[PDB]
């Protein structure tokens, strides 16, 4: 009679239904809440506008695509319940919104790439509103690229007779020769180019961040900040970010050595920082002019690279080059045995806390020592940038693969097994595609929050 039925069990449909609903509460709440939370306030503004556009897109995917497809595409497969305009309209909207979320994710990866990798070059100067026009153009491209779906999709009577009312389905009506063209184009524009961009860009971000020395945010913990002259651990005269000056007693030459203006014992914030910049600069410069400390510095990464600078900052190139064998092991990646060496009477266990903190950094190559404060900014930057690529590709890859085989697996391996597998596959793929628009609110608040670097 109408043997175009699909035999996917009630239990898998309940499962998928559940999942879709969870995805729905999460996606809708997150997108809505973000777009109305950033309906209130450069250059992070630009990334805010990008986020706004993103959340809007995802929200519209959830509102327009989900309910109808949940009914007609996963529960009652035939006939098509919403008429021709229903059919073409649905598919056009689907297409438009997906182009939108893809182009947006890309554009955001591009903007972030610019901000982080070319801060002065790109970010501060070139990047500025109106990038509203960019988002506008994105939406326009979404619409125009979705235009084909209005001609390709349609209503067709596929019942055995081709006359019975219960066989009226929504399906590509044009010649199958063109269907391939259309969906291949869609595959490239909505997945391939974007996914390549996301991939390489975010990878470059991640590597740039992993290679950046968190040295400053590290010292601000250990060394603190006092903009009125004081006494340090061993009772010498210090100001600013632990900048020792005129260590000789007493309070007078200390105040004289306050250069550069008559400090009168007190300094301003921007002065304590500019002082701190010079100190950190003279440390690295001390590292790179010293024959014992340079090649060790060179071989290290970025964390244990900061760890050294800390020590050089605290004790000068002269003292740190006095740790001969520890250096020999650090250069040899003996993190284990070199940590034990430093922990020995190193005499620099006159301040054990600061020493313990530096050795468990050297040892682990991670920031576990420095509390849960945003010295973890870089690492989180990395992880978030990985999350982006993983999330996008995982969520959208199988979706596009399923669409390709609709028109390519075509002829003639279309068995019962394949016809079935196709629809279970469909469940899966739309589940992931809808997982995109619910994972990316929560994820992208984390990258929005992750701009303490700039």
């Amino acid at each position: 009679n109408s043997d175009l039925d699909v035999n996917t069990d009630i239990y898998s449909k309940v499962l998928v239904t559940a999942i879709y609903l969870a995805l729905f509460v999460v996606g809708t709440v997150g997108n809505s809440v973000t777009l109305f939370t950033l309906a209130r306030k450069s250059l992070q503004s630009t990334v805010h506008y990008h986020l706004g556009s993103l959340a809007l897109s995802d929200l519209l995917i959830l509102l327009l695509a989900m309910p109808v497809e949940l009914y007609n595409f996963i529960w009652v497969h035939h006939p098509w319940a919403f008429g021709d305009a229903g059919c073409r309209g649905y598919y056009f909207l689907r297409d438009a919104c997906t182009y939108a979320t893809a182009l947006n994710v890309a554009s955001l990866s591009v903007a972030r790439y610019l901000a982080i990798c070319h801060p002065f070059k790109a970010k501060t100067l070139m990047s500025r509103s109106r990038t509203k026009k960019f988002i506008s153009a994105i939406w326009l491209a979404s619409a125009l690229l979705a235009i084909p779906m209005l001609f390709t999709m349609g209503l067709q009577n596929r019942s055995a007779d081709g006359t019975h009312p219960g066989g009226l389905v929504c399906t590509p009506i044009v010649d199958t020769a063109t269907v391939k063209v259309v969906i291949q184009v869609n595959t490239f524009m909505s997945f391939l180019f974007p996914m390549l961009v996301i991939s390489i860009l975010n990878t470059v971000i991640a590597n740039k961040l992993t290679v950046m020395v968190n040295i400053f945010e590290m010292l601000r913990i250990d060394e603190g900040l006092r903009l009125k002259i004081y006494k340090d651990t061993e009772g010498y005269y210090t100001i600013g970010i632990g900048h020792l000056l005129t260590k000789s007693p007493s309070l007078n030459a200390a105040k004289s050595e306050l250069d550069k203006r008559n400090t009168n014992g007190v300094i301003t914030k921007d002065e304590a920082e500019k002082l701190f910049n010079q100190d950190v600069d003279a440390a690295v410069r001390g590292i790179l002019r010293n024959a014992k400390l340079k090649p060790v510095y060179d071989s290290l990464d970025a964390v244990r690279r900061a760890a050294l600078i800390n020590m050089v900052f605290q004790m000068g190139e002269t003292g740190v080059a006095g740790f001969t064998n520890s250096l020999r092991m650090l250069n040899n990646k003996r993190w284990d045995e070199a940590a034990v060496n430093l922990a020995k009477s190193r005499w620099y266990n006159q301040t054990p806390n600061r020493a313990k903190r530096v050795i468990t950094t050297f040892r682990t190559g991670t920031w576990d020592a420095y509390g849960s404060g945003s010295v973890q900014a870089l690492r989180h930057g990395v992880l978030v940038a990985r999350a982006v690529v993983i999330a996008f590709v995982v969520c959208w890859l199988p979706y596009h693969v399923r669409r390709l085989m609709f028109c390519y697996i075509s002829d003639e391996q279309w068995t019962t097994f394949l016809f079935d597998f196709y629809h279970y596959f469909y469940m899966l793929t739309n589940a992931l595609a809808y997982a995109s628009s619910a994972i990316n609110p929560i994820l992208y608040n984390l990258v929005s929050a992750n701009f303490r670097q700039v």
């Binding site: 175009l4 595409f73 497969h77 035939h78 598919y91 999709m153 067709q156 596929r158 389905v169 929504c170 399906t171 590509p172 969906i183 669409r403 609709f406 075509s410 279309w414 016809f419 196709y422 629809h423 469909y426």
Partner: peptide, 6 residues
């Protein structure tokens, strides 16, 4: 005989 749903 193939799927009708894209």
């Amino acid at each position: 005989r193939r799927p009708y749903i894209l």
